[PDB]
């Protein structure tokens, strides 16, 4: 059957030839072994071959408005990349949540661990008035949990006596993201 051959000898010289050359030579990354992606090969794997005072508080409400600029990173998921308006031992941004108490918000934390949503993403005074993150959070969830000693989220506050700022800092540079320890992590950052 010569008549179907002439397409097919072209097809063997076009389809298998010119595609995988244009595929493989213009593979900038290193030759990802992938399945046929409507056959449910998940391959959700860790190795990735893909590219990687009062008015002072009111001032911190407005001055360091966006000292970070949210972005994905190799560090945990969202390295917010702290850009500008940072210095050592200064209040970066008022941690703001929305929950009033330690006992029944511990009941709420028990309800969190049932769904496994947040073991972290609270901040506790533990006298009372543990402060939430996952209902009206400001920059609460975003601050990370690396083993980098960048930040201290502490309870220095005036007047209202419920303000939580990130007070004591060692000075960081642009795009290196704020890490407070919660009070050998799950970072995998190059200090672990």
């Amino acid at each position: 059957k010569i008549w179907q051959s002439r397409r097919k000898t072209l097809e063997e010289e076009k389809a298998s030839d010119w595609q995988i050359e244009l595929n493989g030579t213009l593979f900038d990354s290193e030759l990802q072994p992938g399945s046929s992606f409507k056959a449910e090969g998940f391959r959700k794997v860790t190795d990735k071959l893909k590219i990687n005072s009062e008015l002072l508080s009111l001032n911190q409400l407005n001055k360091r408005k966006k000292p970070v600029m949210f972005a994905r990173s190799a560090i945990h998921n969202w390295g917010l990349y702290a850009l500008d308006s940072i210095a050592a031992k200064e209040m970066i941004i008022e941690y703001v949540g929305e929950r009033i108490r330690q006992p029944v918000a511990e009941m709420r934390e028990k309800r969190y661990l049932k769904n496994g949503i947040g073991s972290s993403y609270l901040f506790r005074v533990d006298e009372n008035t543990v402060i939430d993150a996952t209902k009206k959070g400001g920059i609460a969830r975003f601050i990370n949990h690396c083993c980098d000693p960048n930040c201290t989220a502490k309870i220095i506050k005036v007047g209202g006596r419920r303000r939580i700022v990130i007070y004591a800092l060692r000075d960081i540079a642009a795009s290196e993201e704020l890490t407070y320890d919660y009070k050998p992590c799950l970072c995998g950052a190059p200090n672990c």
Binding site: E11, A15, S16, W18, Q19, I20, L22, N23, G24, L26, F27, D28, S29, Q32, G34, S35, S36, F37, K38, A39, E40, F42, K44, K48, K50, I51, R72, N77, N115, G116, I117
Partner: protein
């Protein structure tokens, strides 16, 4: 809502897409490196096959114009072929395998999907990229665009949370998560394909478990969930498909089921009733379904293990 039609797509490799292909006519189905065998929906006859490149084309998007067809391979590209012309414009992609496509109402610029969870946007007619909305970490498995809008951008992903995006380059418009991460493994991935309501004010998440909790981006609250009478029978998360079916806007809202490993259900708008499905697992079917699209009373279907099911109904 009851009929069947003649079927056929050479029954070769896996039936990855059966896009209903809105111009009324011109049904198309993959056969692997052979691509998009044309079937006029009235003539019901095999026609032009466009045959772009090597890897199995995952999904097909029907152009508003109907002149140009874009498929999504596994290797390096998302490939546009002009149905009458000679594939005069394919372009580089992200370095990951592409999975899904859909074009906007104007047909102006296109959306690619991503395995590296970083979807890109592409001006069609000039043929380049504008900026890239990388608001995920694990693969954005499905992306659709509603009919009467080019601003809502769907992110059906394997990060367990929908990320609605702006029109072109507005990063991260809103978000939406499903529930219940720890249950299957390491954070659940129910998200399979999110195809909009026609009026661009609702959205349908099909759980990979198989219960369609259909949402509202307006209130952020879910609307009623269509559930089969049997409990946990339809858990069909893995078996070689991510099955999905679109609404049918015949005269009422009509949700067809993307029901994997079983004959697909049909569901009312408001009541949670079963409709007009057969036990026809022998012909076309054996276990799964793969891709279902609907342009009217005509609604197509293709199954995976019964390769090239090639439907149209009523």
């Amino acid at each position: 809502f009851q009929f069947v039609t003649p079927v056929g797509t050479q029954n070769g490799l896996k039936a990855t897409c059966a896009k209903i292909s809105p111009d009324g006519q011109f049904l198309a189905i993959t056969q692997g490196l052979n691509i998009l065998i044309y079937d006029i929906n009235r003539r019901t006859v095999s026609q032009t096959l466009v045959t772009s490149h090597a890897r199995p084309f995952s999904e097909l998007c029907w152009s508003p114009d109907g002149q140009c067809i874009a498929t999504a391979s596994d290797d390096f590209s998302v490939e546009i072929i002009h149905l009458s012309y000679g594939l005069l414009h394919t372009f580089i992609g992200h370095t990951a395998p592409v999975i899904s496509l859909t074009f906007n109402r104007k047909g102006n610029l296109l959306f690619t999907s991503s395995m590296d969870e970083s979807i890109k946007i592409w001006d069609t007619l000039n043929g380049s990229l504008m900026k890239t909305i990388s608001a995920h970490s694990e693969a954005v498995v499905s992306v659709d665009v509603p009919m009467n809008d080019s601003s809502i951008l769907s992110s059906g992903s394997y990060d367990g949370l929908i990320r609605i995006f702006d029109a072109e380059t507005g990063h991260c418009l809103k978000t939406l998560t499903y529930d219940k991460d720890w249950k299957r493994e390491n954070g659940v991935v129910p998200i399979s394909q999110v195809k909009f309501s026609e009026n661009a004010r609702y959205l349908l998440v099909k759980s990979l478990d198989g219960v369609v909790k259909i949402w509202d981006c307006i209130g952020g609250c879910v609307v009623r969930t269509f559930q089969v009478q049997p409990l946990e029978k339809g858990v069909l998360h893995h078996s070689c498909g991510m099955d999905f079916l679109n609404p049918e806007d015949g005269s009422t809202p009509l949700v067809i089921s993307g029901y994997e490993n079983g004959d697909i259900y049909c569901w009312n708008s408001d009541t949670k009733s079963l409709l007009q499905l057969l036990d026809g697992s022998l012909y076309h079917h054996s276990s799964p379904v793969m891709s279902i699209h609907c342009f009217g009373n005509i609604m197509c279907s293709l199954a995976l293990n019964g390769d090239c099911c090639l439907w149209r109904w009523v």
